[PDB]
Design a binder for this molecule. Structure first.
Ligand SMILES: [Ca+2]
Ligand SMILES: [Ca+2]
Ligand SMILES: [Cl-]
Ligand SMILES: [Cl-]
Lengths: 386, 385
């Protein structure tokens, strides 16, 4: 390989993932990777530090050009650069747009189970979550299209937060799916906020369909949100981008980002994001193969060794979604037991709502040696359930 | 000198201060310095980059300890470490608190002329600015205390955004003034948001009185906002700290920061702020020597060579507030003219409201040679009018 995917980066003491651990505990919960970032990103960060003065920065045209170039090359989906607006994070941009584009008490639609932060930003802002729950049958999730449309058609339903690809299930929607969702939203005058943060991590020979690509009959109703954070192991960089084709919505979102204090870059966001999006292609290619290898190992190991659990077929993300229903234990209980008995720390599905209490989420973006250790621990934990 | 106050940092192309300038142009407008940062802070940033993976960060106890040690050493005012809450920036924290601690339509009190971004975050959020204007007489500003109180006691006036020290005028309020303002707010059930971002830049023997030092029960109505950003030339670091003695108000503020997306540090904020506040004392000491020398030169030069303008007396900040009323030109017009004629770029007072249309603001946090150049350009501008 061209890059290092074998050694775990040594963190400083205030790391969430690696701080405040007990001896020999193995964290596989929170969505950050245990790989070094692309050295091309590191080089840009080092060069920027050498300025040795960190005053106010603008977002340059080159930022948006980088975003468009990356989407073109990786997804054959080139947005117009004028559509693009810097924000310091995806979830903060969602929070700002909740406040700008809905009123207190309004309902915002999601598809449960889904990323727990969506509930926080909706409910924390005094909006109300409504779900069109994903249907779970024969170990796969699907949409109830009539139920989704009925809910979208509700007067008080004003926005849809769409996870594309969908976390935690790891599903990159088909083109026809994304188009149908956009069409339904536009039809019912519902803003479609498409959170595309996992969009570079499709592991099959498929690709995402960014919301911004939909036909002009619906394109004015959509916002696509992307960031290098998940793709490149840069949660703390605080660089993201909203892609908003409608100019009036775009102006208003931009104002909302400035109000929230999320519209101006920190001292690294610009050079580091530009380096990721212009020079990170090769590193990503290699990462995807490391991830495929890890998922293949996990799937084979659990199928053969722990038939009590079922790793869902998923096509995107570095997070495995594992049906633990056959164990007959609430996931929160199971994960607490597992950590106590084995030191393995994985995420309980409960906070994703939907049917999440029957699932655990396992982060596989780590060296193979850590995956092996974790699988062994998970097995021992299930075996010891007596 | 132990540290470098003579070379201007060479910026990348997206710098606001230096970014789009004509050859020859001399920017002395926006409040960032033309000095390299303390090497101790650079060292901490370099060390952090070694991690080469930048996942999620907590705020360590060491961060609050650093803040408290800094305040103790530099201001003789140690906060309890428990009072402290990280935020990604002072203005963004003010914005969050406007939304959490007031309702749409409420009035938020300032003292004009004052930092223009206070108006943006009040009005943008759908609150209404109200001012108790600072009275300008005999080349000095003062407070109209009866007017201030009348406004604070108005039912719809819910918060005061208090600039301590006051930008753009450069005034570090006395202990008695800060205590009085806090009392007035508390008595009238108004939250005092004390923006203390210029507090480490008092250039006289005077020192700031942080709002968190006021006696109980007024103390339960105050929030002190600090940051290494102005002190250390770190605006883009996005590290700040709210100091909030009232535990319930503090928890609510923290919640508001997370809700807005400004509660989580970026991948440099923690080590860099810790370095600044633990190891930055000697650099700051030397900086104040250079700033005093710069101000002394500007005052001497303008008194002798440009009697048509008047630099107001100020005890804090690296920004000079200069009365240009004798020129008989709106400040915005004069600054445009000045830039065209001489290439000097200074801030028109208009945007600070109050009586700012009669003033210009000049940033003196640059090498002495740039100050000498800029003062000469100013002279050239004024005399050629
Ligand atoms: Ca193929
Ligand atoms: Ca076996
Ligand atoms: Cl709207
Ligand atoms: Cl309140």
């Amino acid at each position: 390989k061209q890059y290092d995917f074998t050694h775990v980066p040594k963190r400083q003491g205030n790391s969430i993932k690696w701080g405040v651990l007990k001896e020999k505990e193995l964290p596989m919960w929170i969505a950050e990777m245990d790989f070094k970032i692309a050295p091309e990103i590191m080089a840009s960060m080092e060069e920027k530090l050498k300025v040795a003065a960190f005053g106010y920065e603008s977002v340059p045209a080159e930022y948006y050009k980088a975003v468009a170039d990356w989407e073109e090359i990786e997804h054959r989906a080139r947005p117009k650069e004028d559509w693009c607006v810097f924000a310091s994070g995806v979830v903060p941009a969602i929070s700002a747009m909740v406040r700008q584009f809905t009123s207190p008490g309004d309902q915002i639609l999601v598809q449960e189970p889904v990323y727990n932060m969506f509930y926080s930003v909706i409910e924390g802002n005094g909006r109300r979550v409504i779900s069109s729950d994903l249907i779970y049958e024969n170990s796969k999730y699907s949409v109830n299209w009539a139920d989704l449309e009925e809910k979208l058609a509700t007067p008080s339903v004003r926005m849809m937060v769409f996870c594309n690809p969908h976390n935690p299930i790891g599903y990159a929607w088909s083109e026809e799916e994304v188009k149908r969702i956009a069409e339904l939203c536009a039809k019912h005058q519902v803003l479609l906020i498409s959170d595309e943060i996992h969009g570079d991590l499709v592991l099959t020979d498929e690709d995402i369909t960014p919301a911004f690509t939909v036909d002009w009959d619906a394109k004015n109703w959509v916002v696509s949100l992307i960031s290098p954070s998940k793709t490149f192991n840069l949660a703390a960089l605080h660089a993201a981008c909203a892609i908003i084709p409608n100019p009036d919505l775009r102006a208003r979102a931009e104002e909302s980002f400035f109000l929230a204090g999320i519209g101006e870059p920190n001292l690294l966001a610009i050079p580091a994001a530009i380096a990721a999006y212009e020079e990170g292609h090769d590193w990503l290619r290699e990462l995807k193969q490391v991830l495929r290898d890890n998922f293949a190992y996990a799937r084979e190991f659990l199928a053969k060794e722990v038939p009590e659990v079922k790793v869902l077929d998923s096509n995107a993300s570095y997070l495995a979604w594992v049906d633990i229903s056959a164990l007959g234990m609430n996931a929160e209980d199971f994960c607490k037991y597992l950590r106590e008995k084995t030191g393995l720390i994985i995420s309980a599905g409960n906070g994703y709502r939907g049917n999440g209490h029957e699932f655990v989420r396992i982060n596989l973006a780590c060296p193979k040696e850590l995956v092996i250790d974790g699988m062994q621990r998970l097995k021992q934990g299930v075996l010891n359930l007596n």
